[PDB]
Amino acid sequence: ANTLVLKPRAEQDLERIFEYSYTEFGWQQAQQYISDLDQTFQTLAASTDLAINYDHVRPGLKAFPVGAHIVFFRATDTGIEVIRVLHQSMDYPRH
Amino acid sequence: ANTLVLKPRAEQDLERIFEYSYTEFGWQQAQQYISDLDQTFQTLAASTDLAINYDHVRPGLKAFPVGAHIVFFRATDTGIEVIRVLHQSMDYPRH
Amino acid sequence: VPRGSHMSSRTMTVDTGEELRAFVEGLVESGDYKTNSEVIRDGLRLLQEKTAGSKLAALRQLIDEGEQSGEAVPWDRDSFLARMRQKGPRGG
Amino acid sequence: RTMTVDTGEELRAFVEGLVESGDYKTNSEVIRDGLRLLQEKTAGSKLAALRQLIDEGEQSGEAVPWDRDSFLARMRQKGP
């Protein structure tokens, strides 16, 4: 089983994302959204080729979209390490 | 009776002021606010000494407060001519 | 709030459009701002700052636009309020 | 999709005055003008801003295993 760890601030991002969705759409939508995020985490931990190279932000940084958000992460020997989960409005794609 | 006339734009100011008050507070309070403006109109038309000299904005311009708003007006031979009714946040007081 | 008194907090419900809505959402979710309100207040402070140095010109323009809006006509409170009632149903 | 915001009294009155003067049609138009200014202020340094967010993630402590069940339990424990 591939490993999946989160920086403390990424887990705090998820909490803010959950609360934002909860406040406007209620529990079921917020839980669904975190479920979509969780499913994408597992897919990224299993398949190195999905990761988008974000060296232009930081060397070795990877990105992947889910919904209106972007998982920013790094590859590890056994899986991934999630650094931040940010709204896509924060993105800076490669020039 | 002393004369009281309004520029068309001052009448449109009062409509916007009424609608803003109505949306927030409902009919009774919005009509009362207009009625308080009207009472101030009548008092200004009768008493030249109440007018605040606003020459520093435009020669001959006068001002007077009512609620959160300012009546901007000119003195005429028989009374006053209201030019605008503006929120006090638009004011430029004498320095 | 003391008994017999009421809350006087005053909110406003606004439509930012999708582009600026997503902009606000990202700033809140990043932790840069605590609430939608804080983002909106920062924006409003910038708008207030942009015009803070031209309040005299701005007021002169409002006054001139009143002067140029046509000849002045009599004012009647009851007719005004009647016309407000005719625009649609009124309550409260 | 609207939002309900508390501007505080000073900025609320600022917004009201601009609407009642006729310079802006609605509260929303004033708010959007402010947000456009805030977006423009940072539009030119999105890369630095993203780098800062990433760095703050990197510097936020040792990563820990993701535990979805604990997360959702913590979410319902907050004001059940």
Residue numbers in the entry:
A (entry chain A), B (entry chain C): 2 to 96
C (entry chain B): -5 to 86
D (entry chain D): 4 to 83
Structure paper excerpt:
Recently, PrpTA was found to be a pMBL6842-encoded type II TAS with the unique function to regulate the plasmid replication in Pseudoalteromonas rubra. It consists of stable PrpT toxin and labile PrpA antitoxin canonically positioned adjacently within the same operon. In this study, we reported for the first time the high-resolution structure of the PrpT:PrpA2:PrpT heterotetramer and two forms of crystal structures of truncated antitoxin-PrpA2–54.
Overall with the crystal structure of the PrpTA complex, it was certain that the PrpTA biological assembly unit indicated with PrpT:PrpA2:PrpT contains two PrpT monomers, which were isolated from each other, and a PrpA homodimer. In other words, PrpT:PrpA2:PrpT heterotetramer is maintained by one single PrpAFL homodimer interface formed by N-terminal PrpARHH domains and two PrpT-PrpAFL heterodimer interfaces, which is similar to its structurally relevant complex, such as CvParDE, and consistent with the conclusion that PrpA dimer interface and PrpT-PrpA heterodimer interface with an estimated CSS (Complex Formation Significance Score, calculated by PISA server) value of 1 contribute to PrpTA heterotetramer complexation. PrpT toxin starts from a RHH fragment in the N-terminus, helices of which are connected by a single glycine residue, and the β1 tends to be packed with the EF-P OB-like fold that is mainly composed of C-terminal 3-stranded antiparallel β sheet (β3–β5), as shown in Figure 1Bb. PrpAFL begins with an extended conformation (β1) spanning from 5 to 9 aa, followed by the α 1 helix (11–23 aa) and the α 2 helix (30–45 aa). The C-terminal PrpT neutralizing domain (49–85 aa), which is also the tetramerization domain, is connected with the C-terminus of the α 2 helix by a hinge region composed of AGS triad [Figure 2B (upper)]. PrpT:PrpA2:PrpT heterotetramer is formed via a local twofold axis and highlights two extremely similar PrpT-PrpAFL contact interfaces. PrpA and PrpT interact via two hydrophobic subdomains surrounded by electrostatic interactions. The heterodimer interface dominated by a series of salt bridges/hydrogen bonds covers a surface of ∼2000 Å2 with an estimated ΔG value of −17 kcal/mol.
